[PDB]
């Protein structure tokens, strides 16, 4: 069973993501947060296998949280709606294992979690310098 922490500031989306992932047989949402600090605190203390992280959250961003968790054995997957410039370079430098789109089908998110747990790096083509 894969243990997941979800950091997402928009409660509606946070709740929908948790619901979408708890549907999987081999996955479990062990905690939910709305800030980057919530992610740093839970991951350092509870040590889940995976951390699903939004970028822009109040206080500390998911990119800032990812930088603080760079050395911890947790596998971080970034989730964004848009690709603002330099998000990709900052993400890879922080050692994010996944950088996906929030609205990518749920099947693809569960697939990225399994791939990341298998030591793979999953980056949405859309979120890297495209076309």
């Amino acid at each position: 069973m894969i243990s997941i922490f979800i950091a997402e500031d928009q409660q509606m989306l946070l709740g929908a993501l948790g619901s979408l992932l708890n549907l999987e047989d081999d996955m479990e949402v062990v905690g939910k947060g709305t800030t980057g600090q919530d992610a740093v605190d839970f991951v350092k203390k509870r040590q889940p296998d995976v951390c699903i992280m939004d970028i822009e959250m109040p206080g500390k961003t998911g990119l800032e949280a990812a930088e603080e968790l760079k050395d911890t054995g947790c596998k971080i997957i970034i989730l964004t709606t848009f690709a603002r410039p330099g998000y990709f370079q900052r993400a890879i430098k922080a050692g994010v294992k996944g950088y996906l789109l929030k609205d990518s089908p749920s099947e693809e998110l569960a697939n990225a979690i399994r791939s990341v747990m298998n030591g793979k790096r999953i980056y949405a083509p859309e979120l890297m310098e495209d076309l």
Binding site: Q10, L13, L23, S106
Partner: protein, 215 residues
Amino acid sequence: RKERERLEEKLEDANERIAELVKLEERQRIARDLEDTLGQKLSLIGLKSDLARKLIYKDPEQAARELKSVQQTARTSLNEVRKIVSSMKGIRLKDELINIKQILEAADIMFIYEEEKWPENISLLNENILSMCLKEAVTNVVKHSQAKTCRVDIQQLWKEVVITVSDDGTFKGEENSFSKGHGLLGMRERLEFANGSLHIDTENGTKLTMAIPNN
């Protein structure tokens, strides 16, 4: 001489350059709003509908609850996009102007107007009445006149909005062209009820003058 004309130009050329920068500054402010507004609500619509599909047989009740919020979310997203113009200031008449340009072009009738000289600050009711009358005046040009040109003027004079619709065709009506249940009398009755007026001149083609109080 007309060296001043070259200077007057020099100025509006500059003014318009500064206008394009305050326009760009707005475009940017709007993208940030959209980025949150639409971006997020569409991201949510996606996930919530994806989950709704996964619960159709599992929990049909939750699938329904999700769909209720997907409809709610979509309905507001659209109304947030209507709200990025927090004025409604002279907008129905501006939309009717687009409709009549399309209708006249489709009919091979030259449309003569001045988009910049159009009033705002009219009541939404009186604006909607004028839109209706403008539509009818132009429907009449297309159906009856056999005009090659149609000229629309919209002027805010004192406390009336005056619209004139002129065409260079030939008037086809009888001595008294105001008949029960049809456009000319219909426009007059609706305008008069709003304490406005409708006048017609059928000498050199047909010209309708419609006026309504500001409010």
